Amino acid sequence: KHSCIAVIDAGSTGSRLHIYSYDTDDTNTPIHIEEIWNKKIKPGFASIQPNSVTIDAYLTMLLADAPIHNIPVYFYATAGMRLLPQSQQKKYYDELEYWFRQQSQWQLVEAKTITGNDEALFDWLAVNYKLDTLKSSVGVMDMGGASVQIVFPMPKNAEISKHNQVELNIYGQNINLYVHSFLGLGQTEMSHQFLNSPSCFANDYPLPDGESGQGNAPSCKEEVTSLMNSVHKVNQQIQPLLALNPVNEWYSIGGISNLASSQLFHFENSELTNQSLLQQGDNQICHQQWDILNGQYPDDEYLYQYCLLSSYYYALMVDGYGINPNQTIHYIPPEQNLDWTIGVVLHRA
């Protein structure tokens, strides 16, 4: 009845199979993309032993019960696998290539670790698809666990790396995008640099070094800005490009959308500003007595991190990207299930 494609998102914490049915319009672009099946397994691919028994157990658990035969499959790993040397990755892909050759139910089209730029492309396509803006300047930011992505329209520029630019034609229109991924600036990886910063945690929160939190979002933001700008040079790379290529609307996916959906934060219309984010983080968490807070919200296991995270998002978007602290940032809410793999259907199916 419809075309079908499978995309496996092999992420740092788990792998997620998505089977989509779609139709194609007369520009040769997928439409009516529907997720018909879904399977999620932990831990991440890069966290299992790369031998046949382990890979077989893992992929069987992921795929065996799929209600669909003879479908093309894309196996796309992201930041978790990017953290591994090429020679380690090879062990996984040798086993995986062999496993798929033993299954005629699944036609492996590609298995690879996509670059963060690739992932930025798919992010942009996925968001703009959900927003129905694709047949129509929309910027997308993905705040992931290990890497962060930014992507916005920008005219082809021969003085910028080809790796940071993508040309595509979508619903009949030629598009050029600037794409950038910062590996290490994802919230989990970045957090590992700041666990002993008392400025980044609720008062009396027990830091690993035996010291106590003493939260202050402006100070915590400054510490994080050092990693963004002194180490990753985010400001130098992104700000001159945004000054010249203004974005009309920002959309964010990933961790922002989770934090903004917490009980401790108040945001309407699935949008926020950096100023409000930082202020609420500073008041509700950074300067808050930890034990009292923890007692009031005992189920939220991300709570302890909200001072750091609010400071980190502001640092990234404001001090890094140069986004105005009062500029509206839309976020796709967690309930909505927007997935970057929708971008792969658009681009590759």
Ligand SMILES: CCN(CC)c1ncnc2c1ncn2[C@@H]1O[C@H](COP(=O)(O)OP(=O)(O)C(Br)(Br)P(=O)(O)O)[C@@H](O)[C@H]1O
């Ligand atoms: C009550 C408020 N909740 C609970 C919902 C939350 N509050 C704050 N952060 C949350 C969160 N739930 C999840 N996160 C974090 O969101 C960040 C990025 O999310 P993502 O989903 O975007 O991370 P990602 O990069 O795609 C992942 Br799954 Br780590 P993989 O590499 O593909 O496996 C990750 O680092 C998560 O740890």
